[PDB]
Design a protein around this ligand. Structure first.
Ligand code: REA
Length: 137
């Protein structure tokens, strides 16, 4: 797979609901949903090594990881976690997360390149799943 690109969002589902499961209050959800409606996403992939930068007006994250090697990031709601990404399949990576401190819903994410050339991000918190779809700019 080649996940490299500058990716533009074309669909979001259940993001507000995901934030509600994670305990984000309604005013903060409103801020977040609006900002997340127009993100800039940069991915660079070199084999199993990845750089992903996701930028919005209210939050930007930058992660560097190798598939198969633990790394530290934050959950979508901003809590430090340890993460490990695996290939579920040739074109789909899955990341399990464990909080560094405290308790909360079980969180994960997936990124997949679909047969039509798009990118699907999913983010999960307990049983609630957020689906976001992107195409390169
Ligand atoms: C949740 C949350 C916030 C904003 C989070 C944002 C904006 C996340 C965007 C995610 C994207 C942009 C995902 C993607 O597309 O990969 C703010 C800072 C208001 C503080 C309250 C907790």
């Amino acid at each position: 797979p080649n996940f490299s690109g500058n990716w533009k969002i074309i669909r979001s589902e259940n993001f507000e609901e995901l934030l509600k499961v994670l305990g984000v209050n309604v005013m903060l959800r409103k801020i977040a949903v609006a900002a997340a409606s127009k993100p800039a996403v940069e991915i660079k992939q070199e084999g199993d090594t990845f750089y992903i930068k996701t930028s919005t007006t209210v939050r930007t994250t930058e992660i560097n990881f190798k598939v198969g090697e633990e790394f530290e990031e934050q959950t979508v709601d901003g809590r430090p976690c340890k993460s490990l990404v695996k290939w579920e399949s040739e074109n789909k990576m899955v990341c399990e997360q464990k909080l560094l401190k405290g308790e909360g819903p079980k969180t994960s994410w997936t990124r997949e390149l679909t047969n039509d050339g798009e990118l699907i991000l999913t983010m999960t918190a307990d049983d609630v799943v957020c689906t976001r779809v992107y195409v390169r700019e």
